[PDB]
Design a protein around this ligand. Structure first.
Ligand SMILES: *[C@@H]1O[C@H](CO)[C@@H](O[C@@H]2O[C@H](CO)[C@@H](O[C@@H]3O[C@H](CO)[C@@H](O)[C@H](O)[C@@H]3O)[C@H](O)[C@H]2NC(C)=O)[C@H](O)[C@H]1NC(C)=O
Lengths: 282, 133
């Protein structure tokens, strides 16, 4: 039995039919003693009375907005040893049992995480984060939100006193609270910013064809959001025409026309390529 | 520059295969520009002075530490008829080259291949910033 937010509690239960419930006790926070009434929200039945209601939790119906002070009860399911992961969709893709996915645009310390649900009804979401556990360090996160419609939510965070040049050696952890109705789940994701980088696309391509040559000189520039100084935070670029690719860490290349695109990649860690940037060959 | 590539191929290879293995230089060589940022008082510049030798000295010490670690490991490891393998011999050769220019045990090795990759990366970043222009 524990306190989530203000006036809200979670009750952990082995969801097995034969398993014990929890003998729960709702102290009515209102020092008034007197003959007192006790109900479960829209439920007319004075389920109990006195001051300290007491009950058997074991089912959702046994869960709810109790009223005398306030008191909300949400349940945490536990099946066969593992907590429920109903509210969110296992985006599988990254590594299975991957509910929360994040991305970073550079070594700024800033990053977006997003998830998926099939739900549309009551759906509240809490979000916290930090770097390290045995002595966490600060991360400040924004707020959960509908991003696209399966319905997608995302949030934005920023590592606090973050030097882009710092070697990371304790990962960042993102904690997500999900409450769909009276059910309570919570997710977790651990990563190093360097592993979740996906950079924006190469900025402003350019052809510069040469006489006596079907061979062209393609060029571009680092995207504006990338980390500086560039020579320190190198991106490697893939230059394609449409195999016939060209890999380089320069901001130009020589190809042969007949379109032309370029995407970027951190030079060392995350392999996530940036969205393509193209140009008409002719 | 024949060096830079040697360093870069080792990094690419570490990058590609490190999953199949289970388990202050950064400031002393901090780029001038990163100084403008609160949270990062020496630095180096796009041209590549006492700060400069501090940076390089720091890199060189880092390498000596790792060079010993790898040779010790490689000595132990030689008893495994599977002889040695390679990322460590790769990292080691690069360490040697860079210096010139300037189960229980299998776990201890995993740990190290990792710790050094993170550090060769840094070294590689300063080295790349120092050519630049
Ligand atoms: C995500 O879900 C898990 C499982 O429900 C949460 O773990 C549970 O966290 C609560 C609060 O820390 C623990 O409750 C009790 O708190 C009192 C403080 O008054 C403490 O003295 C007791 O030792 C007890 O831990 C509860 O035990 C713990 N579940 C267990 C038994 O492992 C987890 O906190 C959730 N993540 C969050 C905080 O968002």
């Amino acid at each position: 039995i524990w306190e989530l937010k203000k006036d809200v509690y979670v009750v952990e239960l082995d969801w097995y039919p034969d398993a014990p419930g929890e003998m729960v006790v709702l102290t009515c926070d209102t020092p008034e003693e007197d003959g007192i009434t006790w109900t479960l929200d829209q439920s007319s039945e004075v389920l109990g009375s006195g001051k300290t209601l007491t009950i058997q939790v074991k089912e959702f119906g046994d869960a709810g907005q109790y009223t005398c002070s306030h008191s909300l009860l949400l349940l945490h399911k536990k099946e066969d040893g593992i907590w429920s992961t109903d509210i969110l969709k296992d985006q599988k893709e990254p590594k299975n049992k991957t509910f929360l996915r994040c991305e970073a645009k550079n070594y700024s310390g800033r990053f977006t995480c997003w998830w998926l649900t099939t739900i549309s009804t009551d759906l509240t979401f809490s979000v916290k984060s930090s770097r390290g556990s045995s002595d966490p360090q600060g991360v400040t996160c924004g707020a959960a939100t509908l991003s696209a419609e399966e319905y997608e939510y995302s949030v934005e965070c920023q590592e606090d006193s973050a030097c882009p040049a710092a070697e990371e050696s304790l990962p960042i952890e993102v904690m997500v609270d999900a409450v769909h109705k009276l059910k309570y789940e919570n997710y977790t994701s651990s990563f190093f910013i360097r592993d979740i980088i996906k950079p924006d696309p190469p900025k402003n391509l350019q052809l510069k064809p040469l006489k006596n040559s079907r061979q062209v000189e393609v060029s571009w520039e680092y995207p504006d959001t990338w980390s500086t100084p560039h020579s320190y935070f190198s991106l490697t670029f893939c230059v394609q025409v449409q195999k016939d690719r060209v890999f380089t860490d320069k901001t130009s290349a020589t190809v042969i026309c007949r379109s032309i695109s370029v995407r970027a990649q951190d030079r060392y860690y995350s392999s996530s390529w940036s969205e393509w940037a193209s140009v008409p060959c002719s | 520059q024949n060096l830079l590539r040697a360093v870069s191929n080792m990094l690419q290879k570490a990058r590609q295969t490190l999953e199949f293995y289970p388990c202050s230089t950064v400031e002393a060589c901090l780029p001038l520009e990163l100084t403008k940022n609160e949270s990062c008082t020496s630095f180096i510049t796009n041209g590549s002075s006492f700060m400069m030798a501090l940076c390089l000295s720091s890199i060189y010490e880092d390498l000596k530490m790792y060079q010993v670690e790898f040779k010790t490991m490689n000595a132990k490891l030689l008893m495994d008829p599977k002889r040695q393998i390679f990322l460590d011999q790769n990292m080691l050769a690069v360490i040697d080259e860079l210096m010139q220019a300037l189960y229980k045990t299998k776990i201890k090795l995993c740990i190290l291949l990792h710790a050094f990759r993170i550090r060769a990366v840094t070294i590689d970043r300063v080295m790349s910033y120092l050519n630049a222009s």
